[PDB]
Amino acid sequence: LDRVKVLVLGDSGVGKSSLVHLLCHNQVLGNPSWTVGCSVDIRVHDYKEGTPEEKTYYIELWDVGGSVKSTRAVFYNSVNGIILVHDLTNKKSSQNLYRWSLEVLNRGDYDREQFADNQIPLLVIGTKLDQIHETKRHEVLIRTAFLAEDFNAEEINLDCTNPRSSAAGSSNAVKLSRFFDKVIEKRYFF
């Protein structure tokens, strides 16, 4: 049906618009401004690229600009995947992903079984990796791995302002493509 909706959720200022621009254009968002309301960009995605079953899909990235009233629940309809974005320099943004994710999966809590049972693909992306001093890099990656595990989610950590963070063939780009393939599969080829 070619239609795919992926929410991009996280606290204000964590880098959602910068990430989406990188995912959709392989270019850094040079002039980021405060996102008002819901911004949508489209990633033209080759499903199963390189295979005889290769098929192009338009993946909508819905960049919701709210904070954890309940009027943004209307944006959470018909969701096929969720990207949960946190700022690695800002532990509070990481904590709030427990609220961001529940806000969709229900429409200050953590229920491990709710995430064992959830079928909507989840991807946890930590931004501003470049700002993490290497002495503390190890500690933040351990914390972030446990975060991905709580959500039963793949994790990617990157610098949204570095085009090599998502350059073709890179480890990040492969994980991103795998996530988008899973979104498409669970909506259609299930």
Ligand X SMILES: Nc1nc2c(ncn2[C@@H]2O[C@H](COP(=O)(O)OP(=O)(O)OP(O)(O)=S)[C@@H](O)[C@H]2O)c(=O)[nH]1
Our CB check for ligand X shows the closer of 93 and 181 to be 93
> In the numeric block, which tokens belong to residue 94?
């990481």
Residue 32 interacts with ligand X (CB under 6 A): yes or no: yes
Among 13, 28, 38, 102, binds a copy of itself (CB under 8 A): 38
Binding partner at 128 among Mg ion, a copy of itself, ligand X, none, C-beta below 5 to 8 Å by kind = ligand X
Among residues 138, 171, 168, the alpha carbon closest in space to that of 156 is found at 171
Residue 47 interacts with a copy of itself (CB under 8 A): yes or no: no
Query: ∠ CA(118), CA(122), CA(128), 5° rounding?
Result: 150
Write the DSSP symbol of residue 188.
S
- Output the smallest distance, CB 72 to ligand X, in A: 13
Strand pairing class (122-127; 154-157): parallel
92 annotated ligand-binding residue: no
Our CB check for ligand X shows the closer of 18 and 101 to be 18
Asked whether the beta carbons of 20 and 39 are under 8 A apart, the reply is yes
The CA distances from residue 152 to 89, 99, 129, in Å, are: 22, 15, 22
Which helix (H) or strand (E) is 45 found in, with range?
Answer: strand 37-47
Region binding ligand X by CB under 6 A among candidate stretches 30-38, 101-109, 116-124, 149-157:
30-38
> In the numeric block, which tokens belong to residue 178?
């795998």
Binding partner at 160 among Mg ion, a copy of itself, ligand X, none, C-beta below 5 to 8 Å by kind = ligand X
Contact code string over 51-70 relative to a copy of itself, x by CB under 8 A: -------x---x--------
55 annotated ligand-binding residue: no
Binding-site ranges for ligand X (CB under 6 A): 12-18, 29, 32, 34-35, 65, 127-128, 130-131, 159-161
